[PDB]
Amino acid sequence: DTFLEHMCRLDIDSPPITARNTGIICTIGPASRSVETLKEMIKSGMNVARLNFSHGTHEYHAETIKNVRTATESFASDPILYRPVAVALDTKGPEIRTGLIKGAEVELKKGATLKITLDNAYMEKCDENILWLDYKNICKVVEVGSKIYVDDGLISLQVKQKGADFLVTEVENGGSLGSKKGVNLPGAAVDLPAVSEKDIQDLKFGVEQDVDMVFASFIRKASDVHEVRKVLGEKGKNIKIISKIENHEGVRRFDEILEASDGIMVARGDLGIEIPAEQVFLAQKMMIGRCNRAGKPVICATQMLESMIKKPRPTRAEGSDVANAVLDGADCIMLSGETAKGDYPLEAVRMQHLIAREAEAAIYHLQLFEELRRLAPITSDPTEATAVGAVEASFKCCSGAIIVLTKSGRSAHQVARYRPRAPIIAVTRNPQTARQAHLYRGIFPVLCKDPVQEAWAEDVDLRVNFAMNVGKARGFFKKGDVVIVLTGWRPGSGFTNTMRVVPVP
Amino acid sequence: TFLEHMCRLDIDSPPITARNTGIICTIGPASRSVETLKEMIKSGMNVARLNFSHGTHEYHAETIKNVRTATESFASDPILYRPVAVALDTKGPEIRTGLIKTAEVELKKGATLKITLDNAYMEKCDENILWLDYKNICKVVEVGSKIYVDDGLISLQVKQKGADFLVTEVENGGSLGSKKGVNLPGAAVDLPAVSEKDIQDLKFGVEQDVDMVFASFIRKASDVHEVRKVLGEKGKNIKIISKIENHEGVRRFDEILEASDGIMVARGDLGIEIPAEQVFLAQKMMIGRCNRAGKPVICATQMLESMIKKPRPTRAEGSDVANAVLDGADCIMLSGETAKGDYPLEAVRMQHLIAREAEAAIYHLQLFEELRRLAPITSDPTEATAVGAVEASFKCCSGAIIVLTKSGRSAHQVARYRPRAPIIAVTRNPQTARQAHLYRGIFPVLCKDPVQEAWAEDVDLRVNFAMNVGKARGFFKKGDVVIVLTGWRPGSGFTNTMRVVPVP
Amino acid sequence: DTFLEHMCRLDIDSPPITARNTGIICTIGPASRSVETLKEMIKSGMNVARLNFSHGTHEYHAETIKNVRTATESFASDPILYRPVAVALDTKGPEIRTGLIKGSGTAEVELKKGATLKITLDNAYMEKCDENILWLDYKNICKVVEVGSKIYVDDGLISLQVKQKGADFLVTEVENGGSLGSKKGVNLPGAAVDLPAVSEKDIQDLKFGVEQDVDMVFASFIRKASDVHEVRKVLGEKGKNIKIISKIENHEGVRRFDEILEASDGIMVARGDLGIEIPAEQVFLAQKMMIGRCNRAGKPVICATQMLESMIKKPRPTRAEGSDVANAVLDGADCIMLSGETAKGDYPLEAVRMQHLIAREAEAAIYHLQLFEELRRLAPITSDPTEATAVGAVEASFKCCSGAIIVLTKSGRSAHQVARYRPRAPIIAVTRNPQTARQAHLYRGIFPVLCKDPVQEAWAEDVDLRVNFAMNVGKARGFFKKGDVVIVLTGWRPFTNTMRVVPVP
Amino acid sequence: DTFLEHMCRLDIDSPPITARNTGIICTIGPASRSVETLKEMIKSGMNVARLNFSHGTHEYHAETIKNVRTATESFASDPILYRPVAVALDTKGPAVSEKDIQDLKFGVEQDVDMVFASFIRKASDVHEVRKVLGEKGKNIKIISKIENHEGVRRFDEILEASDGIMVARGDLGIEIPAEQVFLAQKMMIGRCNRAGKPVICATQMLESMIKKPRPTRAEGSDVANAVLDGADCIMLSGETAKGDYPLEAVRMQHLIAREAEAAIYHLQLFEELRRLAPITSDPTEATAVGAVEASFKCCSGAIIVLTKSGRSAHQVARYRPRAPIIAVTRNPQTARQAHLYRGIFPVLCKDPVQEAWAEDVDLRVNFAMNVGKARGFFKKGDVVIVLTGWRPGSGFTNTMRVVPVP
Ligand SMILES: [K+]
Ligand SMILES: [K+]
Ligand SMILES: [K+]
Ligand SMILES: [Mg+2]
Ligand SMILES: [Mg+2]
Ligand SMILES: [Mg+2]
């Protein structure tokens, strides 16, 4: 009855429900792009496949998309067990990079001197003495004493001298320098565009390949989102834009970015360098909160199970990080190198599945529902009122599921905002809405392919019966259990205005 | 916060039309005429209480006839027609005097008054000797016991005991009349819960088709069972409201509530049996537990007492009605105010006025949160639909919650969660329409149209009826948002469907 | 847990503490102005004596004051058991009254609905009022009242409406009939009254109050802050320590309550006239509102009028009256008041005792932990060590279930700040200032005790004297016994900055 | 207002301006056991030094302790700045092995402040450890390590019999499913906060910092959430024992911990703790919560507490004030043990006892006034809460004073 007493009552031997609510996004790479491995990842729990356009050609990514769709459609024979898989495009954005090593990695030692050059005669001759990068205007946005970080901020350089096309720096924090490492300038205002010419081509390619969502990198303000929106244009209007917050400016101007975006990713990787590492959790919990309040999907990302790249078991800190991300209210959790290049992609997915499910059984649901309700504005919207009514009814009868018949996903999205314990089975005939539904916590999208019935009454019963079988087959509920059913009152409607409390036949 | 809620209470902010709390009116010489009854219904009367502590069956049969005559005078228009319930108040185990010589003798402090059981003095009462009808009083009373007469106004202390008499000293003098009620706060009264007279009155109630029985002096669960048994099969649908008016009733309250259909906080006798200082504690306790259980609770007795003789109530009385509603009482009651008073109409209107202002002051969202949180998790589809509807109503500021119901069950389940929006209960059952007044916020509406073959057409007919009712009575306008609770498909006997729908 | 669950927990067989916290204010009149009766009323529980200057001469009230002080000082021989009694001056103010009945015939006449009633200003009819013609003392009534407006007579029981208009007369039609007596109060809710808040008579009364050394003033018909300032100015420098309690008896007073409360030392909810100026069904709204804001501001609030009306004629109160007193205490009123019940009723002693019993039971029904949580929540952050000590003591009293909170004060400031947060334990305020001892009754929970011992030279020794005095008081008054725990508040050297938690010796 | 709204209001650019309340326990090993290193680790923010007795001999561990105390007493020429440092013995693990019995008696001779008893399955095991310590080390604060399923189930009797608890997530994650560890952690920390007893979150909090100069995002999140859960101390195992960046690991925990307690809803936590506060006749307990209440009421710079046993300082800490708790004391084994409790920044008195007891108290108070003004807690004109005894030689603490800073 209090947060304190709630923690005191948390017990290990209380099994979670079988349904796992928070989405799992997996970065696809060499370790996981084969059709067979992709099949295993789907039944391991992968909901969204992220394609990182920071690397690889369009031919490479087109091939990955095909393999993802091949693996996904191999389960399409049984619509009851079929799990939709979303495809996400992660833009390169204004990245700053090395720089090919001379060719053995070079050792940077503390106190030593290192020069940065823009002369393209050194772009493949990087060593202990000289360094190249692809930022043309780095010598007009940086002053003496500035901090320069390379390779995930594991190496830091302090500028001593400045020139027309070079920089003399001292090795503050030193380590082994590799080729093509990420460069960060935490204090500098960056001249690089939000949507470059390459970004435009990649975004247009995403529309061509019918991707479900776009992860826009290094979004600093609302105008950056608007540019990405305009590039997608009319043809890609239904493609959701998830803004990645990875700079100080992004956190600072989060409100205007969230409003413009369809969702948010907490990009803790770059954010942990642009911003002091010990401030990251503040940024995470803040953004997750405002997203939960706004009812827009939020993704927690990067290094959640980092050590699982080499180990079949995560660390205790990693197990904690995933659980806490869920407890904070994250709609999706993400895996990068763990699934892209690691030695245990399948293990990393299964682990996130296990932890997330255990975490959502620890959610102080009734307090959370109260807080989310006092922030909910009063409107004349029948879907909004029905969603709230459905969630509270699900708490009242300890529902096995909340069945939502939706065309666009809106009714299912608004149910998810109030965080029910029971899984939300969203029945749809729209393949895209089924895939995009994975962005919201608790939504278990199921795809109906039966022809639409003239008599609307039995067209509803057809879809409801389908959701019943899905719940039974996937072990959410059984005969004699109670479920909530949401549907419109007549076809062609843009609203769900009817709630049902029905026993499972 | 509740404090800040109090600080923001505004006398100028107009209240929502439609008053939710039921008004129960005791019918007597001042209000039993058809003419007066019509005005009382129009003033806001929802239930008519007939007190069988006085009067004959012939007298009450005529009163019931007058109530239904006045009630059915508005029956020509089912849209504006307001159902009126009939309540039978049992005599119960009452201890009474004692016919005087019908004048009044004066009792003075310090004087000696002799209580006798000799029936030779049952019609010869005066300031010297006093007769009463409790044959075992000398066995349950001791020397030093305090004896109260006439609503606890006259107090006597026992000085000596006889086999059939008591010698007492008047400790609180006053004017003594005939047939006055006697209370023995310290004594263990052994009178039967249901007497032979009660049996004949209860059987009479069944014949007269009364909607509810106010069982007097209920001490325990078995007392309720006796009343239930007497009503039997023929009266199994009659609601039993247990009146709590003694210490044992408060002590064994939980089991009484479980065995009953509802509760009356009978402050009159209760304020005599226990210290008057404690009545508000018992009242707030009982209303709280009744709200929690979802069972009707009535606050009664002396709420506008001064209005028996004056056209305006006192400041304590105005406060009393308001706080009763704020406590969470489903119904408010008038006794002498409407039974024998000089301003019965003014009393009804005043309660209506105060009640409506009071529910506007209710912290609706906090009250709902507590009721939502205390709600028991069950597999019942109707209960889930009910609380879901109330949630929806707050979310969309619903004009009303329309409920189709046969037994009233679904309508009652909505009421227990205390929505701000009025509950329009559409039924074809006239009895459930009458019994619906026991629950706050339920505006019962009686559909007279025959049952259609097409089930969806039958539902639409009843729903469109409620829509017309709400518009006519000014609950909502065309284009407003209302909640509609019905069944989903024919056969099943539960309300499991909620629709959020615009007013045509 | 919740308020509802707290209601269900209320137990009638659960005895309250011996101490009764809310003050009882008794109006003194013919039924109670004798020395013999006044002694019994003090024993019954009277804390403040109200002298209604709406009636009586200066000689009359002086004798009443003399009688009050005689009865009070009859207990002075034992300073342990001595209970200070305050003297309040209730001003007449802008009252409008009739008008003596003709004398020929009966005392009261019968005004019948629909009949014509002429109101006159001609002093020839000053003592010849009847069914046909009625005199009142408002000389400007014809110039302010409008045709169609309504006039209320005798506690609003009688209502008339103006039909015609003359120079020194008004022709009215009886709307609500009834029995009309002599010198009855008259209300003009829908009119702009010329009468000043402080008339020439009020000034003489106020100055007379300073002369008689009254403790506080109940200013009648206060409409705005400027009225409070006029009262403050009349009391002047000699009466600057006299508390000004503003009585809210009209719509304007309710409307402009905030500026009034700020300028005042306290507030009376004058439901009598207020229940005539505004609709009677709105009174509880104004009552709970004013009490709430007074509790928030930490200023004393009095609920008054008709709390136990029936006890004027009967030895027992009605059920509505028992409820009214209990709810006023639960609302948060510092003081409850009796008028005709003690002034001229048949059972003034029984009425005082009843208010004592009900108030004590009501205090044991207070949900203290919720109330204390809210009073802190709305408490401004200082920047004042006295505030911090008061709060600490109150919560400390909760933690050890303290028998009392002992406060050494001179102005009363310390004790007031403690009562502001509403502890359950009684507050024993030890002082040598007799006036502050009397004024202390305006605050809930403060039991003022007057120390008669001479000021001991050593400040530390002076403290131990006054503290041990409070111990003996608590013992004798039955608040706590040997072995219990109490809280002590003192200063370090001659504001309150010191707190102690000590076992009762 | 609400917790959700509190999250939305969290600010990265709102600088933490207090001290660092939660303790840092560093496992001492080959990468840290030198006097030269230990001085830098104390400066970095180490409050407790852990010695794992699963390895090493009594001779090796004895040499380790002297270096800790040598490094610690190197600052002992300035009591105003002197950071006390406690010593803890972590056993190897039948409640105690024959080796444990010999190692425990060793710790008493070496004058350790704490004992981290391994594999605590029940309260009887805590009794068999308290027994070995005997009257010799009756002031040795026993911290029970919950490492298996039985420890979790029977946690209530263990917590009662113990002076504190360590959440040993390492071996616990092996016994129970790794996804259940966070549940066990939050439960045990919650109950420990309820019972007013120290709780330690340990193992792999900054695991990657053994070989890398900066931690991962998961590790940075783990430390912060540990503090937000309500942990009194966080621990470093291999990060300080055999790691390559032991100094960086300590400075990282100090940094995360400070940002974490600036994120804590300071009002909601206290209201809950105060709501569950047991009703007793204890004057010190009442004074403590009264002081915390007053501290929130005036935004006190600190809460100065004069204690001998540590109890009065502990009782203030159990109700989680935002203001630092400056505990002035003479018993050196109390100032060091004070690190087990969040918020208590201990200060050791070196001044001789005055005859004028009021002047004696006024000296210890002035001592704290100097300390807090120098360590950036409060300045001149600020308001602080002082908790002392009433009349000399009193049984306990019962007096609260609110006084401007000179
Ligand atoms: K990217
Ligand atoms: K009766
Ligand atoms: K007056
Ligand atoms: Mg990145
Ligand atoms: Mg009765
Ligand atoms: Mg007045």
Numbering used by the authors:
A (entry chain A): 24 to 126, 130 to 531
B (entry chain B): 25 to 125, 129 to 531
C (entry chain C): 24 to 517, 521 to 531
D (entry chain D): 24 to 116, 219 to 531
From the paper:
Pyruvate kinase isoform M2 (PKM2) converts phosphoenolpyruvate (PEP) to pyruvate and plays an important role in cancer metabolism. In contrast, PKM2 has low basal activity and is activated by an effector molecule fructose 1,6-bisphosphate (FBP). PKM2 exists in a dynamic population of monomer, dimer and tetramer and its pyruvate kinase activity relies on the formation of the tetramer. Upon formation of the tetramer, PKM2 can adopt the inactive T-state or active R-state conformation.
For example, acetylation of residue K305 inhibits pyruvate kinase activity of PKM2 in vitro and acetylation of residue K433 affects FBP binding and prevents PKM2 activation. Similarly, PKM2K305Q adopted an R-state conformation because the protein was crystallized in the presence of malonate (0.2 mol/L), which was observed in the active site of the PKM2K305Q structure. PKM2K305Q adopts a similar R-state conformation to that of PKM2Oxalate with a rmsd of 0.48 Å for 1750 aligned Cα atoms. In the PKM2Oxalate structure, two hydrogen bonds are formed between (1) residues K305 (on helix α9 of monomer C) and E384 (on helix α13) on monomer A and (2) K305 and I35 (close to helix α1) on monomer A. The hydrogen bonds facilitate the intermolecular interactions on the A-A′ interface. No such contact was observed in PKM2K305Q structure. PKM2K305Q showed barely detectable pyruvate kinase activity in the absence of FBP, and a normalized kcat/Km of 0.2 in the presence of FBP, indicating a significant decrease in activity. In contrast, PKM2K305Q tended to form a monomer whereas PKM2K422R mainly formed a tetramer in the absence of FBP. Altogether, mutation K305Q or acetylation of residue K305 inhibits PKM2 activity through hindering the tetramer formation on A-A′ interface. PKM2 with an acetylated K305 mainly forms a monomer in solution and forms a dimer in the presence of FBP because the protein loses the intermolecular interactions on the A-A′ interface.
